[PDB]
Amino acid sequence: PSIQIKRVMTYRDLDNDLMKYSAIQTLDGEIDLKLLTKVLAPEHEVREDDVGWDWDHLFTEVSSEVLTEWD
Amino acid sequence: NQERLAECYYMLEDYEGLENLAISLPENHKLLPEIAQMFVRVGMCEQAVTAFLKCSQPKAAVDTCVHLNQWNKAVELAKNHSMKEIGSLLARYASHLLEKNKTLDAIELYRKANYFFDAAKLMFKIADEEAKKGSKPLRVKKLYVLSALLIEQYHEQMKFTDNAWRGAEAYHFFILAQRQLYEGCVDTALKTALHLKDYEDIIPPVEIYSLLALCACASRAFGTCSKAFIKLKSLETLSSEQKQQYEDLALEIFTKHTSKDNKLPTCVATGSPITEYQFWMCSVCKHGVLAQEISHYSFCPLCHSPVG
Ligand SMILES: [Zn+2]
């Protein structure tokens, strides 16, 4: 891939997020609420799909992720 | 010939033949204990237990369940044949496992052995530790759901759930409030945050009231916004610099705008109170969902059990 292409992609990616989350990041556009937004979570983290949660598979998943997180 | 036939089956590894031979023998026999030992060596707990019980040796039938770590069968046979010495076995085995930091293994045994209270306590401790750690809300919700499920299994064994399912609901409504805030339905997000205000014992107060203040600011609820910063500043677990930051932000907000503003069961789907007397109810989590939003979900939003 072209280096200029990588630079353009990086610039667009950086430009995206600011206007993506300016809707709730600031009040009226002049007051920045970065202090209060710190307790929010990423979009994909608060997405849940309607799938049955059986005890065994859920337990295995949470155990695996805990073991990966724990050190 | 029986004695040599069992040896031929064993060396041939035709364990189905061994099982057929053991079930074709009379109630007692000099060969059944040997067959059960063979089964134990190869690892067939069920066939070994049946063979030993045919020999009328329940002590070994439970010693193999302990040895092969089939604690459900061990406890059941202890209850039947009146040994009752396996409680200490489970206690010290789980103590050793905890000494190895394998709490999940302890929970697994306690679930296998139907000691659901102990596994529920362990999962409650783990969920509380995760909540204190401030990890991802979905993970905490899953842990609390599993803990509540263990509590429900213990209660079904008996025949406090208002604590387990409440612990699940706290983080579930946290997630729902965040989702509704992102989706733009600010009014529902504010209502859900106000409803979550009741669970300050589980979720840390700082996160709760910061989210509530954010929802109020994004939804033009400045009275509730002021009521949120009052508690946020008054919180005793905040640093002096953090208190100064909160005070300065509140000062800016309330110089910009005026501070003055303009139980029934709760629907899991949208946090609004269930006004109607007739409403869809879950079969497990015991928390209702409004009749206008039941059909949308193929599983109960709180506990993900099948709808019905
Ligand atoms: Zn439910």
Curated annotation (Swiss-Prot), chain A:
Compartments, record wording: Cytoplasm, Cytoskeleton; Cell projection, Cilium
Question: Which tissues and organs express this gene's product?
Answer: Expressed in the retina, predominantly in the photoreceptor outer segment.
Source superkingdom? Eukaryota
Q: What does this protein do?
A: As a component of IFT complex A (IFT-A), a complex required for retrograde ciliary transport and entry into cilia of G protein-coupled receptors (GPCRs), it is involved in ciliogenesis. Involved in retrograde ciliary transport along microtubules from the ciliary tip to the base.
| Assembly with partners or alone | Component of the IFT complex A (IFT-A) complex. IFT-A complex is divided into a core subcomplex composed of IFT122:IFT140:WDR19 which is associated with TULP3 and a peripheral subcomplex composed of IFT43:WDR35:TTC21B. Interacts directy with IFT122, WDR35 and TTC21B.
Spell out the family assignment given in the record's similarity comment. Answer: Belongs to the IFT43 family.
Q: Which disease is it linked to?
A: Cranioectodermal dysplasia 3: A disorder primarily characterized by craniofacial, skeletal and ectodermal abnormalities. Clinical features include craniosynostosis, narrow rib cage, short limbs, brachydactyly, hypoplastic and widely spaced teeth, sparse hair, skin laxity and abnormal nails. Nephronophthisis leading to progressive renal failure, hepatic fibrosis, heart defects, and retinitis pigmentosa have also been described.
> What protein name is recorded for this chain?
Intraflagellar transport protein 43 homolog
Q: What species does this protein belong to?
A: Homo sapiens
Q: Which residues of the full protein are shown?
A: 122 to 192 of 208
From Swiss-Prot, chain B:
Q: Name one GO biological process term.
A: intraciliary retrograde transport
Record localization: Cytoplasm, Cytoskeleton, Microtubule organizing center, Centrosome; Cytoplasm, Cytoskeleton, Cilium axoneme; Cytoplasm, Cytoskeleton, Cilium basal body
* 4Fe-4S found in the keyword field: no
Q: Does the keyword Cytoplasm apply?
A: yes
Q: Which domain of life is it from?
A: Eukaryota
The UniProt keywords, alphabetically, are: Cell projection, Ciliopathy, Cilium, Cilium biogenesis/degradation, Cytoplasm, Cytoskeleton, Disease variant, Ectodermal dysplasia, Repeat, WD repeat
Q: What induces it?
A: By TNF.
Q: What is its main location?
A: cytoplasm
**GO cellular component, as recorded:** axoneme; centrosome; ciliary basal body; ciliary tip; cilium; intraciliary transport particle A
Q: What does this protein do?
A: As a component of the IFT complex A (IFT-A), a complex required for retrograde ciliary transport and entry into cilia of G protein-coupled receptors (GPCRs), it is involved in ciliogenesis and ciliary protein trafficking. May promote CASP3 activation and TNF-stimulated apoptosis.
Subunit and interaction comment? Component of the IFT complex A (IFT-A) complex. IFT-A complex is divided into a core subcomplex composed of IFT122:IFT140:WDR19 which is associated with TULP3 and a peripheral subcomplex composed of IFT43:WDR35:TTC21B. Interacts directy with IFT122, ITF43 and TTC21B. Interacts with IFT43. Interacts with CFAP61.
Q: Which disease is it linked to?
A: Cranioectodermal dysplasia 2: A disorder characterized by craniofacial, skeletal and ectodermal abnormalities. Clinical features include short stature, dolichocephaly, craniosynostosis, narrow thorax with pectus excavatum, short limbs, brachydactyly, joint laxity, narrow palpebral fissures, telecanthus with hypertelorism, low-set simple ears, everted lower lip, and short neck. Teeth abnormalities include widely spaced, hypoplastic and fused teeth.
UniProt protein name: WD repeat-containing protein 35
